RNA sequence: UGCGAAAGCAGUUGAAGACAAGUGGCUUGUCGUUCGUUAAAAUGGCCUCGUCAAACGGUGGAGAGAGUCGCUAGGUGAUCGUCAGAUCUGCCUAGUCUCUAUACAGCGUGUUUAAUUGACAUGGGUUGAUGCGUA
């Protein structure tokens, strides 16, 4: 249907961002993956996804890391071989932007320790 | 001698063999210094094994050489670990393998009927 | 303490590769249903990681073909699921009394 | 929330035989 | 697991006189060591579950491509009414 | 009929029944006897390939 | 359509372990290979394979024994001037002697003490030694004639069985025996101590297990014993004086098996820890020293080597060995560390046991006494046949329509109607006396219910009846190698059949007139027969791979320049091709195949231009397609106008000898 | 390769000549060759010199093991059953309860803060693995 679509308009030549947009649209886990084994090949996928997650790292939207950890889970048979030449560093500083969340869930399963307590202590002086 | 890669003296030092270069390949010659005793020299791929010439340059790349106080015989080490024992009279080789790495010295005994090797293994 | 001694000498002296390549559905099974065991503990489950890590690196086709290892990965999913739950409810507690300094 | 996405961006970085009987076709 | 909600309990409650004695980490070392090396190797084992994850997912998608088609592929048969009608001897008996 | 046909098999077969305190065997056939070799003594071929396949030289 | 291909691996035809290999003649290396020489192989199933090592080993014939019959030791006897014997002992009491033409023992000699374990021959050849479980070395008098064989003289008894046995000379016999020991007797006639044991030797035995000495050769040129035994050490012995020389603690496992060259400036050892070692003597220093050094190792084997044999004559110097995995390894004598090697296949079908019929898409295949027929489809199996009054098979045909099965071996035959219940099949069988009396080779069904015989002695039947056949001249070595004019070969459809004998004659035969019009017309052994009824031709193929047609009522233009036209795959082949047939669509392009590879040659056109018995020796007198991407092949057929049938096999603890770990 | 912190941050990967193989050239690959740039594999693995038994002194332990269907908290199954719930006195886990040569592990006792003694002719020969069943 709308996977369809968004297929077809991601398989012909253009529209990358509007097609991870539409993919985004309905949203299947089942679809996110059939959408995955469908294709034969991607029109650079990784690439633009690099550059998504690279400007975004900390976003809501679970849509296109979904999309990453799915296509890194079925086809890193194949990305680590499509290409070498910008895809190095597009690895390289993906990573680099992913690598300081975990430099920095330490301080906020910290912070989550802090708040409980506060919370806690907070409900239990209630006042009688 | 006019172009040597590697070159060995006998325990007496009566005789002292080396290697040549000189052309398909390398070349071996042993020469007795003190007297013209004897001097002989062959193309060592009479040496090598047949199935040295399709597998890697380690195992025909010679990395030392040893002979004893005769002249019969001659231990060629490999860099691929092994040892060849060749016969200086008539060119039949034997192989000595336990170096699992590559083989680094070699001696003879003065009888000759003992061989020393040491390598990257400290044995 | 000798299971563990005897992993971390094959891991820090040769390979964990050499010591886990001739392997098969039966030979695995003892390696994987210690790790089961050693993934609670902490002072085996560095070693634990990486060798589970490892034997998954150059096994996941016979996780494809025995369905009677794929049970074990998914006992040590769980495993590894009530560990990192406990290794995180460590780190909050571990900032809330940080908090009572 | 935060924690949240830390844990799953933190997951993305650590994540970055013969039959008996064939039938095939040949050269005529 | 079940104790820990005892130690929370009581920083909770006991939050002025443990922030009023001088040397907390001196006086309940064996804590702050026991959770040092209990959240240490979280890393470690997010970089486990996100490799042991990754790969059982991986076969739980490629063997649920294909789930129903062992319910019914084992037609397996054994020596049949074929091996009474081989037996020749048994075939000249009966 | 499950439980007793290689009874029936080998009861048939075999010769040499008793009578009493005889027993009568039977001759066998030129056909076989110059047909073919007698057979293995399977004793002794069981002991060499037993042999070759003992436990001391760890086979696999 | 194009090709659609059945690559079947439902036959799991298995051979069984080579257990003694054997040459025809002795080395003689300063002399040219003769005509006459035979390797012979001794499977552990019972069945004796004889090979002739020109072109590429081709397999000339082969022995097969029935149920529970095996073959532990074979030694061949060639007197000067008469013919080839061949002697064997089984798991038994008995030797026995076959006669090479009809493939039957024409000799059960029962030894007269227990159940022999080693045999070998007298030099000269006129008496043969038995090396029995109770201790007995028994002579057999030999030179009465090829058939008839004496007792002469049970040597002086022992306790522990005695498990190889070897002849220094016509004089003494010298024997390993299962308590350790090496024992010297004296078989000189005509002496004092004759038949008493003259010297014992024992070897250093193993500390926790008994100690068993498994092979002893004689070393003529210098003065020695070789012996191996179950430590995998492998000892020289000095002969007079009766002493070890020297030892080397050589193998890791027993030495089952060593042999040495004709000068003895080599001895070649094997055993169950799979690795050939070499013990050399050929420097001056070592012959005027009498030193042996351990000179060289090789790792060619999978699991076993249990025979080992060597051959050296002026073009052939090879030592082949073979052992539990069920392959032949051919090395070279005096270039064995340095030389290559061929490992033979498992299998070379010179003898089929598979074959289809294109009606009901069925495909019968008979392993050891027992048949299997399954149909496409997928496939299933829709009969079998275990019949167990039988105890050896042999060749076997089913009728067009797929009405009647014939199976076949040298005693008897016996034919069953089959017809199709459904998901199974009803097979009865159909009486006739005849056919329960006589010997059967070749059966290949003229019609729906004629059938041609070729019968192991030489006669060509016609039932359901006599075929004139000329004879052949008889020369040396049709007199030495007692088989070669024997009918290997018959290929029939449509009252016209041709049959072949391995002297390179090839007559066809007429089934009306049964008259012959001969067509020998060749040079060597003859490898395949296909009739082609376009062209009115016959195709033959011999050892050298060479393809010659002919025509009926000598070769045609498109043999004339299709013979030195041919493909460099067919000049570089190593595998005979076993069978030809011809397309189904097409009845002029024919369609053939060995056991590594399928070919197919076309009619008319013809392409532009531009470790073996190799010597001077003579042979036994005194569109163009090609794949190998169904190489360990058993056999190929047809089916209707589009599709294939490639029926191949398929695969036990060995001594682990790792492979570096990284 | 450079700067670095253990993270990372910038840079890449040319040329000549000779030789080998394949089909004088052409292609490919090497180099105990030179100039410039900051720049996986030859079946091939580690010595003897004395073992065994019983203690003793420090050091670690996830304790090595066996029960009680005894308590606390759970996870879950077979068959029937609308559920309610029945029988299996359902099973498994963790903790608790009870007991043992601290059963477990390691280093040391030649002098050390500490802590040891004793057996044995440390050989040769014949069987010993085809002699064996409690499964």
Redesign the interface.
């Given at each position: 249907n709308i996977l369809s679509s968004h297929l077809e308009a991601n398989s012909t030549e253009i529209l990358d961002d509007l097609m991870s947009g539409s993919w985004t649209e309905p949203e299947i886990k089942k679809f996110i993956l059939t959408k995955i084994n469908t294709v034969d090949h991607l029109s650079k996928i990784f690439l633009t996804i690099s550059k998504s997650i690279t400007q975004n790292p900390w976003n809501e939207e679970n849509l296109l890391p979904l999309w990453l950890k799915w296509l890194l889970t079925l086809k890193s048979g194949e990305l680590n071989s499509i290409k070498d030449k910008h895809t190095k560093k597009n690895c390289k500083h993906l990573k680099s932007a992913l690598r300081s969340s975990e430099e920095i869930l330490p301080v906020l399963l910290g912070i989550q320790g802090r708040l409980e307590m506060l919370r806690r202590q907070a409900k239990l002086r209630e006042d009688l | 001698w006019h172009n040597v890669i590697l070159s060995n003296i006998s325990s007496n030092g009566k005789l002292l063999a080396h290697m040549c270069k000189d052309v398909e390949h390398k070349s071996i010659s042993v020469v007795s210094l003190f007297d013209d005793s004897v001097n002989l020299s062959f193309p060592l791929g009479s040496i090598l094994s047949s199935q040295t010439q399709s597998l890697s340059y380690n195992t025909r790349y010679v990395s030392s050489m040893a002979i004893d106080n005769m002249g019969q015989q001659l231990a060629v080490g490999f860099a691929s670990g092994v040892i060849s024992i060749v016969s200086l009279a008539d060119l039949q080789i034997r192989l000595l393998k336990w170096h699992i790495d590559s083989v680094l010295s070699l001696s003879f005994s003065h009888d000759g009927s003992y061989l020393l090797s040491g390598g990257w293994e400290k044995v | 303490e000798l299971t563990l001694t005897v992993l971390q000498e094959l891991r820090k002296r040769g390979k964990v590769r050499v010591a886990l390549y001739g392997r098969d559905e039966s030979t695995l099974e003892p390696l994987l249903n210690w790790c089961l065991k050693g993934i609670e503990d902490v002072r085996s489950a560095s070693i634990v990681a990486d060798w589970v890590a490892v034997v998954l690196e150059l096994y996941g086709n016979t996780l494809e073909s025995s369905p009677v290892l794929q049970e074990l990965m998914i006992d040590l999913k769980t495993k590894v699921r009530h560990e990192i739950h406990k290794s995180k409810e460590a780190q909050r507690i571990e900032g809330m009394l940080q908090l009572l300094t | 929330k935060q924690v949240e996405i830390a844990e799953r961006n933190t997951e993305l970085w650590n994540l970055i035989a013969l039959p008996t009987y064939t039938m095939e076709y040949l050269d005529i | 697991?079940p104790l820990?909600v005892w130690?929370?309990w009581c920083?909770?409650?006991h939050?002025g006189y443990?922030?009023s004695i001088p040397n907390?980490?001196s006086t309940l070392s064996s804590?702050?060591s026991?959770?040092?090396?209990?959240?240490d190797?979280?890393?470690?084992?997010?970089?486990?579950?996100?490799?042991?994850?990754?790969?059982?997912?991986?076969?739980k998608?490629?063997?649920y491509?294909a789930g129903d088609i062992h319910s019914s592929e084992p037609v397996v048969?054994e020596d049949?009414?074929?091996?009474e009608?081989?037996?020749?001897?048994?075939?000249?008996?009966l | 009929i499950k439980t007793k046909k290689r009874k029936t098999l080998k009861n048939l077969r075999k010769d040499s029944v008793k009578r009493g305190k005889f027993r009568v065997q039977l001759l066998s056939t030129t056909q076989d006897s110059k047909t073919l070799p007698p057979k293995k003594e399977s004793s002794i071929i069981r002991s060499k390939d037993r042999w070759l396949n003992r436990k001391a030289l760890n086979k696999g | 359509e194009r090709m659609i291909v059945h690559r079947c691996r439902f036959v799991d035809f298995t051979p069984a372990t080579i257990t003694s290999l054997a040459f025809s003649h002795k080395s003689n290396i300063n002399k040219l290979t003769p005509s006459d020489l035979r390797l012979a192989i001794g499977r552990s199933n019972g069945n004796i394979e004889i090979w002739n090592p020109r072109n590429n080993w081709f397999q000339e014939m082969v022995i097969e024994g029935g149920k529970d019959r095996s073959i532990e030791g074979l030694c061949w006897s060639n007197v000067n001037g008469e013919s080839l014997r061949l002697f064997s002992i089984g798991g038994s009491t008995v030797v026995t002697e076959w006669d090479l033409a009809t493939g039957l023992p024409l000799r059960n000699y029962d030894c007269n003490s227990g159940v022999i374990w080693s045999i070998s021959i007298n030099d000269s050849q006129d008496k043969l030694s038995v090396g029995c479980d109770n201790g007995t070395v028994v002579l057999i008098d030999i030179s009465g004639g090829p058939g008839v064989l004496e007792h002469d003289t049970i040597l002086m008894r022992q306790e522990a069985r005695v498990l190889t046995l070897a002849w220094k000379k016509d004089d003494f016999v010298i024997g390993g025996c299962s308590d350790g020991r090496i024992r010297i007797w004296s078989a000189q006639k005509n002496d004092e101590n004759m038949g008493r044991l003259l010297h014992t030797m024992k070897v250093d035995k193993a500390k926790k297990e008994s100690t068993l000495v498994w092979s002893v050769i004689y070393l003529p040129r210098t003065d020695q014993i070789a012996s191996g035994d179950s430590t995998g050490s492998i000892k020289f012995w000095d002969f007079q004086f009766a002493t070890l020389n020297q030892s080397f603690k050589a193998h890791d496992a027993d030495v089952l098996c060593l042999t040495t060259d004709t000068d003895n400036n080599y001895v070649f050892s094997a055993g169950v820890d799979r690795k050939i070692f070499q013990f050399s003597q050929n420097t001056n220093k070592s012959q005027k020293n009498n030193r042996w050094v351990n000179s060289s190792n090789r790792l060619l084997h999978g699991n076993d080597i249990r025979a080992i044999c060597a051959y050296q004559s002026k073009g052939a110097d090879f030592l082949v060995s073979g052992g539990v995995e069920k392959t032949l390894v051919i090395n070279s004598l005096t270039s064995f560390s340095n030389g290559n090697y061929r490992k033979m296949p498992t299998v070379e079908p010179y003898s089929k046991n598979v074959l289809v019929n294109k009606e009901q898409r069925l495909v019968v295949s008979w392993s050891e006494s027992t048949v299997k027929i399954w149909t496409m489809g997928n496939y299933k199996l829709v009969c079998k046949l275990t019949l167990k009054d039988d105890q050896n098979i042999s060749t076997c045909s089913l009728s067009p329509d797929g009405q009647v099965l014939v199976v076949g071996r040298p005693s008897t035959t016996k034919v069953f109607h089959l017809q199709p219940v459904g998901n199974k099949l009803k097979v009865t069988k159909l009486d006739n006396d005849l056919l329960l009396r006589t010997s059967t080779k070749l059966v290949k069904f003229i019609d729906n219910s004629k059938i041609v015989i070729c019968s192991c002695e030489d006669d060509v039947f016609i039932v359901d009846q006599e075929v004139e056949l000329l004879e052949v001249t008889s020369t040396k070595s049709s007199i030495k190698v007692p088989y070669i004019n024997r009918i290997n070969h018959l290929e029939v459809d449509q009252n016209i059949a041709v049959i072949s004998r391995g002297c390179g004659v090839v007559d066809i035969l007429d089934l009306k007139a049964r008259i012959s019009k001969p067509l020998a017309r060749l040079n060597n052994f003859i490898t395949a027969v296909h009739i082609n009824t376009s062209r009115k031709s016959v195709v033959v193929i011999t050892a050298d791979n060479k393809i010659y047609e002919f025509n009926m009522n000598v070769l045609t233009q498109w043999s004339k320049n299709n013979t030195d036209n041919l493909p460099k795959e067919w000049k570089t082949l190593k595998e005979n091709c076993v069978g030809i047939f011809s397309d189904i669509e097409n009845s002029s392009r024919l369609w053939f195949w060995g056991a590594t590879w399928i070919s197919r040659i076309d009619f008319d056109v013809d392409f532009p231009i531009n470790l073996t018995i190799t010597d001077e020796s003579n042979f036994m007198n005194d569109h163009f397609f090609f794949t190998d991407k169904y190489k360990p092949l058993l056999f190929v057929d047809l089916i209707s106008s589009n599709e294939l049938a490639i029926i191949e096999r398929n695969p036990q603890k060995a001594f682990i000898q790792p492979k570096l770990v990284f």
């Open positions: - | - | - | - | 697991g820990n130690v929370k920083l909770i409650i939050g443990l922030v907390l980490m804590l702050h026991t959770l040092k090396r209990r959240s190797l979280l890393p470690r084992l997010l970089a486990l579950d996100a490799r042991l994850d990754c790969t059982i997912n991986k076969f998608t490629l063997n491509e048969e049949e009414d074929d091996v009608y081989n037996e020749e001897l048994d075939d000249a008996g | - | -």
